[PDB]
């Protein structure tokens, strides 16, 4: 028995998850069969919190649910309908937990864009027709905070396309204060932002294709504009258009185009904002306090902190979020050090200078939790391995007092940890993601004792002893004075004296990491397990978590180094023994599809065939926030030269050497079908034959059940034939 | 040496044409190297009419030219830009032939939609921004006849999309009177006609794809509306909004949706109109005279003629044009007889009845010319062969006096004749199109003597003796009580004892003819000549020129019989000895790609693989005027059942048996990319793998140089591999 295509497509061998939501410092919620329980971390006793059959007679399939922090109500999400990556619209109902009743009066309206409880109690903020509405009690009418909401144009409390995708990574553009006093929120004006237009074909029943219009700023176009507002939730008369206090931006930002690039409450009346210049090498953090007499908000110029880089852009993808101390007069934040690595800096609100509380030739991944005693963070420090993630705690009173809480718990099975903390960090869950099978455990902060095994994946482990699994080799090579890391999926019973066909798996994007220690069951699995193909990945220049030395290498020169290094990576895998060098392939999605595409066009004659899924083909076509962060503006004064020098269309000729499969979803809002339509065009003009495949009404995911299957099947056939 | 792909793609062996424009009863114009001459048919003397170098210093490449009937001016078309099938826009200049001067005053403006001389003299009618303009003299200002012209909405003197394509087959919707007194013209209101919208990608330079919007009535939608107008060209004050006399329609037509479906001047003041009901089984011809006292036009109810069919629709694609006698009180017209064949009927203006002046089991193709002595017509009567076209003359005073003027002139080389007549029919050109090489000859009507050989294609004939050409077998088979014709391109040295792979070439549309006697040098040529593949065609039910018995068979049941008969055809070619029955393919464009598609989806297991280019996939998606002419309205009262039963989507499942290559131009206005996007979708839902290929910014012709090459190359590889 082997790991076949269908094993992968039909999810034959499921990985197990343990999904819990902390509701207190010592309690969380689990979902079981169809039941919601609640486990106690201190005792281990659990009690049915809601019973599976409670909504057999609801009449609607329940997509998701939310429980008000004070446990008084449960929010029922249904009639879900996806939009973009994180955005969607739904109907909502509120069920009363104290009683046993579905609230009928003053319900949350159909087509609601976003919804959220206050961090405390059961206040509701909800965006609907682009406008904000508040409900202090589930059964009472709602206070319409905004009136300016207009479709495709004004966004109140929700992001527009570009902010959703490239900045915040959610639909929601609002933010409760810790006790739920204030509702901070952002506003987006798409007024002069140009529309991307594309057909949507719908059911065969639909006689005329719908044209879809989306405010989308391509590289160097008119951006959306943003204002920020804070509202008081308490002072709300049922006969008063409620008063929203606009916090304006710093004037160092108001000189040109800017983006609001972070929002973090510090205390009950202190809120921190972070602003980014359109040229994204210079950032600023305001700290804004409440003038109780005025009702205004005051951002002291003395409390501002500047973040900037000389070597490139600011942040990994944006400037990091801050982690404030209970009182809120000092904060911790991840920044590049002088050597260019990403470590934690301790800041005093009024002191421009900070002090680095971690150091080394590694990078802090993220600050996970902060107490009066400790700061919890993830880094790749253990064994100088960047593919690995571990939980550490550092003594706030003694910065030389660092203990790894996860390194030693299972060195062979576990090297990729994520963490979930209880309120105020009494307990933590550790999720291990590889290189062995996923391992989920509970832990108490107090003494760092391993309470229990929540999931071991024994169930799966049993099935996998029956199946001929491939192995995963993670190593490095040395190119210049640097080690660059790579990973390989080796077919089961890998004989290093034979010659194998190799498929270079490509992403290669600024701050990518395709070489890590995670356990995966994907298509690559199948390709090694069954077709005895080596699927390799490699993190060349531009990849992240290895200091700005490597990451910023790609700066202002996209589609150059990261592309060259992937070709180089092939060369070196051939210098090892096991690679048939007349059957080397390359594939990629999105950025990786672009890189896959630049490679096939490089003339390097290293690769027989490649597949490009939803590739970017020319940077000018991609959105501004992402493109410019890397390439600045496409104008002869700024960077137009490297824009025009980095296209796939320019390399159209060299595809005469290779066999190319090009695949794009026609309803892709993210990388537009445009990009592939320009590619297919170029090739045709210079007479290169190739393979194409469009996916009707698919997006950037090609993620619908049928399509996902179809595309992956189709690509197999292609690689099979290409390799014979 | 063989006929390779490149031979075809790079036009290696050119067929020769002889293109002449009659300017008188005895003189025509020829174009040579770069010169315009004029030949005299009577003497044979020719004189340079315009010299090649006359416009070396013009500064613009001249796309086309027109010479005023009175030889006084030449119209120079340049900055040509194609729109749809017949429509385009251009700049114009007028060069004075009497003098030697390019007119500078009051020029014809850039972006002109259409332009035409009066049949006599040198009046100009020209449509520009949808409005009509007249110039009686090239140098004087122009009288703006219409003011109602609005883009995409009101069409003055030009057709909109659906009329252009499906009705008239030109851009122009105006009509001079014989001496150039009147300018009859049509008007089109697209006001509630729905828009087809589709992207256009342009040069890679273009950052946001252009959306293209076109008033296109899909089957059963809101149609454009039409009004008709006649103007007097003489009474034109340079300070008078000129008066256009609206001729309204008959009231048997005004009860519902109608189309103007023909316009033919009878005399200097008698004009004939033909109106068609939206349900296209009932037509009417008005005959409208000029009330000199009134300045109005009068369509006597006593002069109306009704044309209708019980077995289906009226006409081959529309009701025929009439041919009036010099005085204009009687006309000749081609209609179905009682047996259902298309012959000539002699009509008196006031008598409802006509008399058939031809009869038999064959069809009159068209009335070519009419004198006071004779009527010239083309028919397929010779040898009971429908694939063949011949020129006959019938004695107007004696209907039993018919002589074929072309049958016997070269029986072996020539069976497909077209004709070009001089003014009042003193001389005629015969174009022979096959089965041998094209042969162009000059003839005098008077005695029917063959004056000279204008082109013999000897030049080509020489090259083709060096090359291994395939042969062409035209035969029939008997299916029911009927003979259905087929044709076959046999590889060179065709050994009927061997087993050959066969490609069924498919069109199959209502009134199609793929089986004829014409000499072609296309892709099929290469496929037989080089890949020893038999390329067959077959004219099953629904095909034309074989009476309404066969043509109307397909009525109201599209995607049924014509599809079935093609499968049948295969069966029969296998019952002959020469066909490998494990390597039978099928291909088709437009209608033929739909039929290719319905077949591969029929489950008949006869065909290994097929290619569908720009196929219709569901009839509701195609335009009204074509679809309904065959299928009526798509409503449960009328025909919705056969609409829904005839889709390619419905046969998605069976494609599992075959290998399918689906090809569509993204910028196709005619058969929308929609149609293939619905097809590719269906297949993906039921899990059928297939092959796809889109062509960025190509139209329904995929006719751009590069693309034409690319597609035909791509299709070769597919057939090659499919046949091994
Ligand atoms: N839209 C871009 C950003 N996608 S993303 O929202 O997913 N940002 C990357 C990212 C990865 C990981 C994390 S983290 N470490 O917080 O989980 C944040 C952001 C990715 C992208 C790049 C392309 F080149 C492209 F063609 C399309 C595309 F979506």
Task: Return the bridge partners of A91, or none.
Answer: A78
Within a 10 A sphere around the Cβ of A530, how many other Cβ atoms? 19
What's the Cα-to-Cα distance from B155 to each of B161, B166, B189, B249, rounded to whole Å? 10, 16, 7, 18
Plot region of A589 (φ>0 → left; ψ -120 to 50 → alpha; else → beta): beta
Integer CA distances (angstroms), B355 to A24, A73, B273, B333, B427, in order: 99, 89, 21, 10, 28
Task: Respond yes or no: is residue A668 known to be catalytic.
Answer: yes
| Pair (A520, A443) in one structural domain | no
3-state secondary structure at position B111: coil
Residue A195 forms contact with B (CB below 8 Å): yes
Q: Which residues contact B711 (CB under 8 A, 6 or more apart)?
A: B613, B663, B693, B695, B702
DSSP class of residue B20? -
Q: Which two tokens stand for residue A132?
A: 């904000």
For ligand 1, atom 27, the nearest C-alpha belongs to A590
3-class SS of residue B607: coil
Candidate from A159, A165, A620 with most ligand 1 atoms within 8 A of CB, to mutate = A165
Minimal CA–CA distance to B627: which of B549, B555, B548, B544? Answer: B555
**Displacement of CA A107 from its chain's centroid (Å):** 32
Beta carbons of B508 and B541 less than 8 angstroms apart: no
CA-to-CA distance for A605 and A603, rounded, in angstroms?
5
Beta bridge partners of B231: B183, B244
Instruction: Check A694 against B682: CB less than 8 A apart.
Output: no
| Other residues' Cβ atoms within 10 Å of the Cβ of residue A141 | 11
List the CATH number of the domain containing A562.
Answer: 3.40.50.1820
In a shared domain, residues A323 and A470? no
Residues B6 and B19 in one domain: no
CA of A614 to the centre of ligand 1 (A): 14
Which residues make beta-bridge pairs with B449? Answer: none
Q: Provide the Cα torsion A703, A709, A713, A716; round to 10°.
A: 50
Quote the CA–CA distance of A107 and A122 in Å, as a whole number. Answer: 15
Q: Using CA atoms, how far apart are residues A581 and A502, in angstroms rounded to an integer?
A: 8
Inter-CA distances, A483 with A478, A541, B558, Å: 4, 11, 67
Which stretch of DSSP H or E encloses residue B589? Answer: strand B579-589
Return the HEC string of A323-392: EECCCCCEEEEEEECCCCCEEEEEEECCEEEEEECCCCCCCEEEEEEECCCEEEEEECCHHHCCCCEEEE
The residue with tokens 């003055």 is B156
Burial class (CB in 10 A: 0-12, 13-18, 19+), B686: middle
Residue B412: how many CB atoms within 10 A of its CB? Answer: 7
* A408: three-class secondary structure by DSSP: helix
Decide if A607 contacts A584 (C-beta within 8 A): yes
- What does residue A370 show for φ and ψ, rounded to 5 degrees? -140, 125
How far apart, in whole angstroms, are the C-alpha atoms of residue A137 and residue A133? 12
Contact A470, A453 (CB under 8 A): no
CA distance B662 to B610: 9
On whether the CB atoms of residues B399 and B356 are closer than 8 A, the answer is no
Bridge-partner residues for A302, per DSSP?
none
Point out which residues pair with B230 in neighbouring strands. B184, B245
Rounded to a whole number, what is the largest CA-CA distance in chain A? 82
The answer to whether the CB of A599 is under 6 A from ligand 1 is no
Query: How many other β-carbons are positioned within 10 Å of the β-carbon of residue B28?
Result: 22
* Residue among B304, B310, B253 at smallest CA distance from B281: B310
A684 touches chain B (CB under 8 A): yes
Task: Give chain A positions within 8 Å (CB) of B720.
Answer: none
Q: Are strands B374-379 and B390-395 parallel, antiparallel or unpaired?
A: antiparallel
Residues B574-613, buried b or exposed e (16+ Cβ, 10 A)? beeebbeeebbbbbbbbbbbbbbbbbbbbebebbbbbbbb
The CA A166 to ligand 1 mean position distance, Å, reads 7
Residue of A118, A142, A244, A590 with catalytic role: A590
Looking at chain B from residue 165 to 194, which residues have their Cβ under 8 Å from any Cβ of chain A? 194
In sequence order, the 6+-apart residues with CB closer than 8 A to the CB of A657 are A603, A605
**Ligand 1 and A589: CB distance under 6 A:** no
Q: Is B493 part of the annotated catalytic residue set?
A: no
Given a contact cutoff of 8 angstroms between Cβ atoms, the answer to whether B597 and B617 are in contact is: yes
Q: Is A670 in the pocket of ligand 1 (CB under 6 A)?
A: yes
Count of other CB atoms within 10 angstroms of residue B191 = 13
Tokens of B511: 């009134």
Ligand 1, residue A614: give the atom nearest the CA.
26
Q: What letter does residue B633 receive in the DSSP assignment?
A: -
The whole-angstrom separation of Cα A161 and Cα B469 is 61
Q: Which of B430, B457, B484 is the last residue of a domain?
A: B457
B669 in active site: no
Residue A168 beta carbon below 6 angstroms from any ligand 1 atom: no
CA distance B680 to chain A (A): 7
| Residue B163 contacts residue B259 (beta carbons within 8 Å) | yes
DSSP single-letter state for residue A552: G
Resolution reading in Å: 3.2
CA-closest candidate to residue B145, choices B79, B59, B233, B39: B233
Beta-carbon contacts of B223 under 8 Å, excluding residues fewer than 6 positions away, are B162, B193, B217, B257, B259, B278, B624, B625
Same domain, B487 and B424: no
Q: Are A246 and A227 in contact (CB under 8 A)?
A: yes
**Whether residue B135 sits in one domain with residue B63:** yes
Experimental method: X-ray
Question: How many Å lie between the centroid of ligand 1 and the Cα of residue A253?
Answer: 25
DSSP structural state of residue B538: E
Calculate how far, in angstroms, residue A506's C-alpha sits from the geometric centre of ligand 1. Answer: 15
Residue B451 belongs to what domain range?
A: 15-457
Residue nearest to atom 18 of ligand 1 (CA): A317
Contact A386, A380 (CB under 8 A): yes
CA B330 to chain centre: 28
Closest CA to B321 of B302, B307, B337: B307
| Separation CA B372–CA B379 (nearest Å) | 21
Q: Six-digit token pair at B180? A: 């150039």
Spatial neighbors of A671 by CB under 8 A, at least 6 apart, are A590, A614, A615, A616, A622, A664, A700
Residue in the block written with tokens 């006959």: B392
Complete DSSP assignment for A275-292:
EEESSTTEEEEEEEEEET
CB–CB of B453/B505 below 8 Å?
no
Which residues on adjacent β-strands are paired with residue A164?
Answer: none
Helices (H), B206-326: 251-254
| Å between A669 CA and nearest CA of chain B | 13
Pair B30, B49 in one domain: yes
Which CATH number characterizes residue B121's domain?
2.140.10.30
Rounded to whole angstroms, how far apart are CA atoms A541 and A510? 9
For ligand 1, atom 3, the nearest C-alpha belongs to A166
From chain A, the residues in CB contact with B691 under 8 A are 691, 693
CA A564, CA A646: separation in Å to the nearest integer?
A: 12
Pick the closest to residue A390 from A375, A406, A411 (CA basis). A406
What is the radius of gyration, based on Cα positions, of chain B? 26
Give the phi and the psi of residue A174 in degrees, each rounded to 5: -135, 170
DSSP-assigned letters across all residues of B118-172: -SSTT-EEEEETTEEEEESSTTS--B---S--BTTTEEESB--HHHIIIIISSSB
Cα A21 from Cα A31, distance rounded (Å)? 10
Task: Point out which residues pair with A489 in neighbouring strands.
Answer: A472, A535
Angle between helix B591-600 and B561-575 (nearest 10): 70
Contacts of B208 in chain A (CB under 8 A): 194-197, 218
Q: Are residues A676 and A696 in the same domain?
A: yes
Of A647, A673, A706, the CB nearest to B685: A706
The reply to whether B259 and B311 lie within a common domain is yes
- Count Cα atoms within 13 angstroms, Cβ side, for B594: 22
Gap between the terminal Cα atoms of chain A: 22
Q: Tell me which of B395, B429, B457 is where a domain ends.
A: B457
Ligand 1 test: best mutation among A162, A169, A170, most atoms within 8 Å of CB? A169
Report the alpha-carbon distance of residue A528 to residue A507 in Å, rounded. Answer: 19
Q: Are B503 and B442 within one domain?
A: no
**Residue entry with tokens 């207190």:** A24
| Tally of domains within chain A | 2
Same-domain check for residues B404 and B533: no
* Strand A427-432 to A439-444 pairing: antiparallel
Which residues 6+ apart lie within 8 Å of A594 measured at CB? A559, A588, A612, A615, A616, A617, A648
Tokens representing B101? 């001067």
**Distance from the alpha carbon of residue A28 to the mean position of ligand 1, in angstroms:** 30
Nearest to B718, CA basis, from A684, A657, A663, A691: A691
Gap between the Cα atoms of A475 and A454, Å rounded: 31
**Chain A contact for B650 (CB, 8 A cutoff):** no
- Check whether the bond before B435 is cis (ω within 30° of 0): yes
- Compute CA distances A533 → A498, A595, A611, whole Å: 12, 21, 15
Q: Which of A208, A674, A691 sits opposite B196 (nearest CB)?
A: A208
Which residues, in sequence order, are CB contacts of A437 under 8 Å at separation 6+? A15, A413, A456, A457, A460, A461, A519
User: Residue B321 carries which DSSP code?
Assistant: P
Burial status of residue A387 (CB atoms within 10 A of its CB: 0-12, 13-18, 19 or more): buried
d(CA A603, CA B413): 53
Burial class (CB in 10 A: 0-12, 13-18, 19+), A283: buried
| C-alpha separations of B479 from B226, B361, B385, B483, B600 in Å | 44, 18, 17, 6, 22
Nearest to A432 by CA among A445, A444, A443: A443
Q: What angle do the packed helices A705-723 and B673-685 form, to 10 degrees?
A: 90
Q: Are A343 and A334 in contact (CB under 8 A)?
A: yes
Is residue A6 located within the same domain as residue A83? no
Query: A86 exposed, middle or buried (CB, 10 Å; 0-12, 13-18, 19+)?
Result: middle
Q: In angstroms, rounded to a whole number, what is the distance separating the alpha carbons of residues B299 and B248?
A: 9
Residue where a domain stops, chosen among B457, B477, B508: B457
Q: Are B452 and B482 found together in one domain?
A: no
Both structure tokens of B198: 């589709």
Kindly state the tokens that stand for B293: 């006292």
């Amino acid at each position: 028995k082997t790991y076949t295509l269908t094993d992968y497509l039909k999810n034959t061998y499921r990985l197990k998850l343990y999904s819990l939501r902390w509701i207190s410092d010592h309690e969380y919620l689990y979902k079981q069969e169809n039941n919601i329980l609640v486990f106690n971390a201190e005792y281990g006793n659990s009690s049915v919190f809601l019973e599976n059959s409670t909504f057999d007679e609801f009449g609607h399939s329940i997509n998701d649910y939310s429980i008000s922090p004070d446990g008084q109500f449960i929010l029922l999400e249904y009639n879900y309908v996806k939009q973009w990556r994180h955005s969607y619209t739904a109907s909502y109902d509120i069920y009363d937990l104290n009683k046993r009743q579905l609230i009928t009066e003053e319900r949350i309206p159909n087509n609601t864009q976003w919804v959220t409880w206050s961090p405390v109690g059961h206040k509701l903020a909800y965006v609907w027709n682009n406008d904000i509405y508040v409900k202090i009690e589930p059964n009472l009418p709602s206070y319409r905070i905004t009136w300016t909401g207009k479709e495709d144009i004004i966004y109140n409390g929700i992001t527009d396309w570009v902010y959703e995708e490239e900045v915040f990574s959610a639909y929601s553009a609002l933010w409760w204060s810790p006790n739920g006093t204030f509702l901070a929120y952002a506003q987006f004006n798409d007024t002069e932002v140009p529309l991307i237009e594309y057909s949507f074909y719908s059911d065969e029943s639909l006689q005329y294709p719908k044209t879809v219009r989306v405010p989308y700023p391509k590289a160097g176009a008119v951006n959306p504009t943003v204002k920020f507002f804070v509202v008081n939730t308490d002072s709300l008369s049922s006969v008063t258009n409620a008063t929203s206090i606009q916090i304006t931006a710093p004037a160092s930002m108001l000189i040109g185009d800017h983006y609001l690039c972070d929002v973090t409450w510090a205390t009950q009346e202190r809120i921190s904002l972070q602003w980014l210049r359109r040229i994204q090498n210079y950032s600023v953090m305001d700290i804004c306090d409440y003038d109780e007499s005025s009702g205004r908000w005051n951002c002291l110029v003395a409390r501002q902190h500047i973040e900037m880089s000389t070597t490139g852009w600011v942040g990994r993808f944006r400037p990091s979020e801050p982690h404030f101390t209970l009182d809120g007069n000092s904060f911790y934040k991840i920044i590049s050090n002088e050597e260019g690595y990403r470590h934690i800096c301790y800041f005093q609100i009024d002191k421009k200078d900070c002090t680095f509380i971690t150091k080394g030739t590694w990078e802090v991944i993220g600050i996970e939790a902060l107490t009066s005693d400790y700061l919890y963070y993830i880094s790749n420090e253990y064994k100088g391995m960047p593919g690995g993630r571990n939980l550490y705690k550092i003594q706030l009173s003694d910065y030389t007092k660092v203990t790894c809480l996860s390194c030693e718990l299972n060195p062979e099975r576990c090297q990729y940890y994520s963490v979930s903390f209880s309120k105020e960090a009494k307990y933590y869950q550790l999720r291990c993601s590889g290189p062995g099978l996923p391992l989920y455990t509970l832990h108490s902060s107090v003494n760092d004792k391993g309470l229990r095994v929540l999931e071991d994946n024994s169930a799966l482990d049993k099935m996998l002893q029956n199946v001929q699994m491939p192995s995963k080799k993670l190593d490095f090579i040395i190119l210049n004075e640097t080690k660059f890391w790579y990973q390989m999926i080796l077919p089961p019973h890998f004989d290093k004296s034979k010659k194998y066909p190799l498929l270079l798996d490509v992403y290669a994007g600024p701050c990518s990491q395709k070489a890590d220690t995670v356990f995966r069951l994907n298509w690559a699995t199948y390709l090694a397990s069954t077709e005895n193909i080596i699927v390799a990945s490699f993190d060349g220049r531009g990849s992240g978590y290895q200091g700005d030395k490597i990451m910023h290498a790609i700066n202002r020169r996209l589609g150059t180094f990261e592309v060259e290094d992937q070709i180089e990576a092939a060369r070196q895998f051939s210098k090892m023994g096991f690679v048939d060098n007349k059957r080397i392939a390359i594939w990629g999605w999105s950025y990786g599809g672009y890189v896959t595409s630049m490679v096939l066009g490089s003339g390097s004659g290293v690769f027989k065939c490649g597949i490009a899924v939803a590739p970017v083909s020319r940077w000018e076509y991609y959105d501004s926030v992402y493109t410019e962060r890397y390439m600045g503006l496409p104008t002869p004064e700024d960077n137009l030269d490297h824009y025009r020098n980095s296209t796939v269309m320019s390399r159209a000729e060299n595809f005469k050497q290779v066999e190319y499969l090009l695949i794009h979803g026609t309803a892709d809002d993210n990388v537009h079908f445009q990009q592939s339509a320009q590619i297919s065009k170029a090739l045709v003009d210079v007479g290169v034959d190739f393979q194409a495949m469009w996916y009707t009404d698919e997006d950037h995911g090609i993620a619908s059940s049928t399509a996902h299957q179809h595309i992956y099947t189709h690509m197999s056939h292609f690689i099979k034939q290409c390799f014979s």
